[PDB]
Design a protein around this ligand. Structure first.
Ligand SMILES: *[C@@H]1O[C@H](CO)[C@@H](O[C@@H]2O[C@H](CO)[C@@H](O)[C@H](O)[C@H]2NC(C)=O)[C@H](O)[C@H]1NC(C)=O
Ligand SMILES: *[C@@H]1O[C@H](CO)[C@@H](O[C@@H]2O[C@H](CO)[C@@H](O)[C@H](O)[C@H]2NC(C)=O)[C@H](O)[C@H]1NC(C)=O
Ligand SMILES: *[C@@H]1O[C@H](CO)[C@@H](O)[C@H](O)[C@H]1NC(C)=O
Ligand SMILES: *[C@@H]1O[C@H](CO)[C@@H](O)[C@H](O)[C@H]1NC(C)=O
Ligand SMILES: *[C@@H]1O[C@H](CO)[C@@H](O)[C@H](O)[C@H]1NC(C)=O
Ligand SMILES: *[C@@H]1O[C@H](CO)[C@@H](O)[C@H](O)[C@H]1NC(C)=O
Ligand SMILES: *[C@@H]1O[C@H](CO)[C@@H](O)[C@H](O)[C@H]1NC(C)=O
Ligand SMILES: *[C@@H]1O[C@H](CO)[C@@H](O)[C@H](O)[C@H]1NC(C)=O
Ligand SMILES: *[C@@H]1O[C@H](CO)[C@@H](O)[C@H](O)[C@H]1NC(C)=O
Ligand SMILES: *[C@@H]1O[C@H](CO)[C@@H](O)[C@H](O)[C@H]1NC(C)=O
Ligand SMILES: *[C@@H]1O[C@H](CO)[C@@H](O)[C@H](O)[C@H]1NC(C)=O
Ligand SMILES: *[C@@H]1O[C@H](CO)[C@@H](O)[C@H](O)[C@H]1NC(C)=O
Ligand SMILES: *[C@@H]1O[C@H](CO)[C@@H](O)[C@H](O)[C@H]1NC(C)=O
Ligand SMILES: *[C@@H]1O[C@H](CO)[C@@H](O)[C@H](O)[C@H]1NC(C)=O
Ligand SMILES: *[C@@H]1O[C@H](CO)[C@@H](O)[C@H](O)[C@H]1NC(C)=O
Lengths: 588, 550
């Protein structure tokens, strides 16, 4: 459907050129008809070093000049002739050129170019301080046809310039389609017009929706008067420059309400039912890095390679933490790894292969820098089929793999970690997948008894499943409820702050707009249409903080007021910027 | 004879972990020295074969304290376990202590006098909780053994020492001191009698450094290449570096430091200093890339780049920005990033330039346009419609290898009229030049915008002496000049093929006569300070460091 727009740096049925139309160094027999439908060039037009005889831009009506050439020109036409032959630019068939919103005109030194000294350029240029430089071109050019009244883009009777502009009633501020005070141009007009409508503009001040000059494109979300909330808008159009389009140019993508070539750094390209859009990344954006060991040729994380993990959320391959990496290799001198630089791994959620820890800084008592690691794949293993191996780490008290829930394959080796507690009671089968028998080499860590006697056992709120360390937030799963991934004793159902509802075994807060009820449930769920009672105002089913005031519905903006009972009801049918009540006296 | 952690020296730590009971350990037989430490943990083999191991330096140590660390070498539900440490020749441990604990089936470690092997008097020895009903030592071993056999004895090493020897001795007599180049002890007073070398070991001798790269020769009173030279591998002097180590200075390293590069010389790999910076290649702009212009999303990827594989395209949207797809406008100063460029393999293409920059001086180091890719109708160099440019400024451009040259519509471009393109552009000259509609020559002549008189008939890339393609007389630092400092001036000089190089720093500058005919000491007319054969030196030799001793 009429994707009428094209980039500048100008093909088949293009109507608007988003960007500049640059034409340089093209030969005399170039096919230029593909430029036929261009109606608007949002940049500037540059025509230099060519040898074709006629520039066919019959439909070109506006040159917007959002960008200008040489700092001052919306049109720049220079040097279009070969010396040792007579192939040259003879005609600018700009027969419909109606206006130029920004910048001036430079047409100089085109030896066979005629009639450019005839045009009233000040009539086309909207900028009163713009530069017009037309000179040293034609020589002996044939005269304008008798009809054209001394102004033409060519010799023919239909190659005339038409004066467009008229003196404007001081009422209109330059924008008028006649001299009378009646004939002001629509506000959404960049220049002049042929009549008072948003559909009669020569050019749009902000956006263009199927020919209509509008202040915004039809939005993604529209208030629904029967639903009392915003709703998806099936008539949404997105911004490509100043043109509302139904679909983005075909390898553009949508960053809410706009067409862009690639997502911003805080968002990521999701496909929604075949609609390429940009969704916000929950924190940081999915970056995968290749790991360490076999299939890489780092064989350990070290002070030379570590930064190559900054902001990395998925590891393609393995992560090996050997002694030479940690403490340095003075012989092939790799300096000693800075311990704090291990926090770069806090951002890791998946490891595709194995994790392998044979050395750790002695002051760090746990592998808590992997508190966000959820998944060890084990699709490549280490030694005797191990996906997780933790060996001879003498200062480590606890594992601290808070958020680990899946070791997809491989075996688990945790041995010689002589001060290691909290792992004795842990039920690996809830984490470890596949057949359970054969799979555990867990020996010669701290003796269980020692752990028990120092009170280094799981928090009581943990389930029979175990913990990765002391306290509620190290549990594998909670006995009852959890709030913010911390095991807890209850939810704030009938008292307490913030009041909450429970979904599955988690405590979530009620909507901020629900009124805290005393000794009865405040809500069944997260949405403001689930509260027992609104604090503040009710809008249909929804508890809101203040009634709608100018939210865009389908037929204009919606405006409401608070009732006696505080329920939002609509403003008088004959108001504008709102109301304080239903009466006609109450508006604005 | 040496290797990293039939090897004899283990350069690095010897770590043996997680090995099964009948793994072949025989590749360790001959190991004589282990720099740093030995770690033996979590294993299930019955005997650890290190018959020849004599020295453990502990240049790197385990757990902050141990040159030997042997821990937990036994399986519980099988009877696979470490029973013997066959360390029969272990003579000394230069730094660090000994940790042998938790080895359920390891025998005899309670019999060894570790304090006799240990060189550090404050080192930690922790031997505990190992084998339990262990056989006794053979009667011969006098209560000290690494095993049950008569052949498995610990033999003492240390001897109380005459104070002239302070810890380094092969006997109790003052007569019996160890050679100073000895790390620990010895079997005699010589270089060859050491247990381990304090610094370096050359084919058996403990030496303080390896055979030098240069040897003094006084038939010529100069230093020379030495056919008896050797380079440093940790502590082993070798004739050739390990197969893809390379030599930096006198040392073997696996890769050069920053500031230098692998030259293949003599048929043996060395590391030579660069000067400015070291050859970095980057991919360019245009066909074969994601870019159709260098732009501010693009600029930083060129820092410190000497060679461009591909092209360099300087389009207008690239310079002024693209508001439509939100690519901002280039900071003009960030163009200086290209000063470091010496070669462009494909084409250079400048269609837009910052309005305050009057020349392409940012490529003043550009030496070569390859033209291995062309632009438009076969252009190697295209400079078009730059209205602000006075001069090209390709100071150093000497070769455009193939393709055509387009220089047009650069309304104030002077200094290019006189240029002999056939010296820059070779192959057939004719029909390769598209040069028109720049500043007209006449006007240039009239504003005094022509080549310096010092330039040759070849032309210039701008105003002044240092824009010449070639000089009529002499040149100093790519700057044309009238003369070299032959008979006066404070840096005195000589001329080689019309270039001024300083005399060697030692000549006494004297008056109205040539100070030197050449670069080298042995060319001056007459020296300040003192002469040694043909050569000017100051600071007469402090000992003849050379051919056979100082
Ligand atoms: C995991 O280890 C870290 C540090 O190794 C522990 O954080 C320390 O907490 C204890 C007591 O509060 C002290 O050693 C320090 O105040 C903390 N050090 C640092 C560097 O934060 C953390 O408590 C451990 N996790 C546990 C025990 O669950
Ligand atoms: C090349 O261009 C640079 C800057 O465009 C010139 O340097 C300027 O030289 C003028 C005098 O000719 C000074 O007044 C300016 O202050 C200088 N500015 C900068 C930024 O350098 C340079 O002289 C030009 N000509 C060459 C290199 O031959
Ligand atoms: C808006 O785009 C449409 C394409 O359907 C077309 O009418 C015209 O080129 C544009 N309108 C104006 C006023 O420029
Ligand atoms: C890493 O992400 C953080 C996000 O807060 C950002 O500040 C930083 O620039 C990023 N660094 C790299 C190298 O990606
Ligand atoms: C991991 O936890 C750290 C805590 O500071 C946080 O910066 C990061 O966003 C967390 N990542 C995930 C995936 O939760
Ligand atoms: C561990 O969890 C698994 C799966 O949930 C379960 O089958 C098993 O009974 C649990 N182990 C114990 C000891 O309860
Ligand atoms: C929550 O668990 C706590 C302690 O584990 C216990 O006192 C209580 O009975 C549990 N509550 C519910 C509702 O199961
Ligand atoms: C909460 O639950 C009730 C019944 O349990 C239901 O009518 C509705 O979903 C909610 N009603 C409120 C919060 O008034
Ligand atoms: C505005 O509203 C009334 C009733 O809603 C309607 O008859 C007419 O259009 C207007 N009347 C006024 C402004 O009195
Ligand atoms: C020095 O090197 C020789 C080379 O054969 C070797 O045999 C000898 O044992 C070494 N001596 C040391 C390391 O003290
Ligand atoms: C290029 O010139 C700059 C001048 O500052 C210098 O840094 C660089 O070393 C030069 N490169 C070459 C190859 O001479
Ligand atoms: C570029 O070279 C300079 C000069 O040695 C150095 O200081 C800088 O770190 C280098 N930067 C990059 C990105 O290569
Ligand atoms: C240009 O240089 C070459 C040799 O360097 C010479 O053949 C030619 O004559 C020169 N051009 C002119 C105009 O002399
Ligand atoms: C350099 O050459 C020119 C012409 O060949 C000559 O006139 C001039 O005197 C020379 N300069 C010197 C210092 O000899
Ligand atoms: C000085 O050097 C030049 C060129 O190498 C040579 O012609 C001349 O004979 C030399 N004279 C002496 C005394 O070395």
């Amino acid at each position: 459907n009429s994707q009428a727009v094209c980039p500048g740096t100008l093909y088949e049925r293009c109507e608007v050129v988003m960007g500049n139309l640059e034409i340089v160094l093209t030969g005399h027999n170039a096919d230029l008809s593909f430029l036929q439908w261009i109606r608007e060039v949002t940049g500037y037009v540059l025509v230099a070093m060519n040898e074709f005889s006629t520039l066919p831009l019959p439909n070109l009506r506006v040159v917007r000049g959002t960008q200008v050439y040489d700092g001052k020109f919306a049109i720049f036409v220079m040097l279009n002739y070969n010396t040792n032959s007579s192939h040259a630019l003879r005609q600018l068939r700009l027969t419909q050129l109606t206006e130029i919103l920004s910048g001036g005109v430079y047409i100089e030194k085109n030896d066979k170019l005629c009639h450019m000294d005839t045009i009233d350029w000040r009539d086309i240029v909207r900028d009163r301080d713009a530069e017009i430089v037309v000179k040293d071109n034609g020589r002996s050019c044939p005269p304008c046809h008798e009809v054209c009244k001394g102004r033409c883009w060519g010799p023919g009777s239909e190659d005339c310039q038409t004066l467009t502009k008229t003196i404007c009633a001081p009422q209109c501020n330059g924008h008028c389609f006649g001299p009378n005070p009646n004939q002001c141009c629509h506000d959404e007009c960049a220049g002049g017009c042929s009549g008072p409508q948003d559909t009669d503009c020569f050019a749009c001040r902000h956006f263009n929706d199927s020919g209509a000059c509008v202040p915004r494109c039809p939005q993604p979300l529209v208030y629904n008067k029967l639903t009392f909330q915003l709703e998806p808008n099936p008539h949404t159009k997105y911004q490509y420059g100043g043109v509302c389009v139904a679909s983005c140019p075909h390898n553009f993508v949508v960053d809410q309400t706009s067409c862009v070539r690639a997502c911003p750094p805080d968002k990521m390209e999701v496909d929604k039912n075949g609609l390429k859009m940009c969704e916000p990344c929950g924190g940081l954006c999915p970056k995968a890095c290749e790991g360490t060991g076999s299939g890489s040729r780092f064989q350990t994380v070290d002070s030379s390679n570590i930064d190559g993990f900054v902001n990395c959320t998925k590891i393609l391959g393995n992560l090996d933490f050997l002694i030479t990496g940690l403490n340095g290799d003075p012989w092939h001198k790799i300096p000693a790894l800075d311990p704090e630089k291990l926090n770069v791994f806090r951002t890791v959620r998946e490891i595709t292969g194995y994790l392998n820890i044979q050395s750790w800084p002695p002051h760090m008592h746990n592998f808590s820098v992997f508190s966000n690691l959820t998944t060890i794949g084990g699709r490549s293993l280490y030694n005797r089929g191990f996906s997780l191996l933790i060996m001879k780490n003498l200062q480590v008290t606890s594992l601290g793999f808070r958020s680990l829930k899946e070791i997809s394959a491989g075996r688990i080796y945790i041995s010689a970690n002589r001060q290691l507690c909290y792992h004795h009671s842990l039920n690996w089968t809830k984490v470890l997948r596949g057949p359970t028998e054969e799979r555990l080499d867990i020996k010669h860590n701290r003796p269980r008894r020692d752990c028990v006697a120092e009170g280094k056992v799981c928090d009581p709120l943990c389930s029979s499943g175990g913990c990765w360390g002391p306290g509620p937030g190290q549990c594998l799963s909670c006995r009852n409820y959890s709030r913010g991934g911390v095991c807890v004793t209850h939810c704030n159902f009938l008292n307490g702050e913030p009041r909450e509802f429970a979904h599955e075994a988690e405590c979530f807060s009620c909507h901020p707009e629900c009124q805290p009820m005393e000794g009865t449930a405040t809500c069944n769920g997260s949405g403001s249409d689930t509260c027992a009672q609104c604090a503040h105002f009710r809008d249909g089913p929804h508890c809101v903080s203040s009634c709608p005031h100018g939210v865009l519905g389908a037929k204009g903006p919606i405006y409401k007021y608070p009732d006696v009972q505080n329920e939002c009801r609509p403003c008088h049918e004959n108001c504008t910027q709102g109301c304080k009540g239903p009466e006609l006296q109450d508006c604005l």
